[PDB]
Amino acid sequence: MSQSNRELVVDFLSYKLSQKGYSWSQFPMAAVKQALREAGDEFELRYRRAFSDLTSQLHITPGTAYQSFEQVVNELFRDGVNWGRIVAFFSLGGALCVESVDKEMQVLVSRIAAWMATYLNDHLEPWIQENGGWDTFVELYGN
């Protein structure tokens, strides 16, 4: 969870930055990572401009505090956690990183990654573990 989730977060954000033409330099595991990269693409394919509201409600800057990030992300989980919402959470972080690079605030990329790992470990792992762990995630989204 600790380092594990951190690595998962960094992998997803690096993937998204790479995929969209940006640098990722400011930074069964292999199976979890692949299932998550793919799940995110699927989500973004069928949910365009998904987080306009949220990112807009956040408009991150180098002075933004974790609490503001936490408060906004909590919105995705108004009705609790589920796999689709966890995938949205990853896509949202990816969108925030892209937005940060576009605003010439690449310094926020590693910060967003830390915030995501903290949020994942604190609010999401409880549910994930109760529902099969990442193995169940791979089982549902893998291949």
Swiss-Prot record:
A motif (BH2) lies at residues 126-141. A motif (BH4) lies at residues 4-24. A motif (BH3) lies at residues 32-46. Changing D122A: No effect on caspase-1 cleavage. Changing G84A: No heterodimerization with BAX. GO terms for cellular component: Bcl-2 family protein complex; centrosome; cytoplasm; cytosol; endoplasmic reticulum; mitochondrial inner membrane; mitochondrial matrix; mitochondrial outer membrane. It comes from the Eukaryota. A motif (BH1) lies at residues 75-94. Keywords: Apoptosis, Cytoplasm, Cytoplasmic vesicle, Cytoskeleton, Endocytosis, Membrane, Mitochondrion, Mitochondrion inner membrane, Mitochondrion outer membrane, Nucleus, Phosphoprotein, Synapse, Transmembrane, Transmembrane helix, Ubl conjugation. Belongs to the Bcl-2 family. Potent inhibitor of cell death. Inhibits activation of caspases. Appears to regulate cell death by blocking the voltage-dependent anion channel (VDAC) by binding to it and preventing the release of the caspase activator, CYC1, from the mitochondrial membrane. Also acts as a regulator of G2 checkpoint and progression to cytokinesis during mitosis. The BH4 motif is required for anti-apoptotic activity. The BH1 and BH2 motifs are required for both heterodimerization with other Bcl-2 family members and for repression of cell death. The loop between motifs BH4 and BH3 is required for the interaction with NLRP1. Homodimer. Interacts with BCL2L11. Interacts with BAD. Interacts with PGAM5. Interacts with HEBP2. Interacts with p53/TP53 and BBC3; interaction with BBC3 disrupts the interaction with p53/TP53. Interacts with ATP5F1A and ATP5F1B; the interactions mediate the association of isoform Bcl-X(L) with the mitochondrial membrane ATP synthase F(1)F(0) ATP synthase. Interacts with VDAC1. Interacts with BCL2L11 (via BH3). Interacts with RNF183. Interacts with GIMAP3/IAN4 and GIMAP5/IAN5. This is Bcl-2-like protein 1. It comes from Homo sapiens (Human).
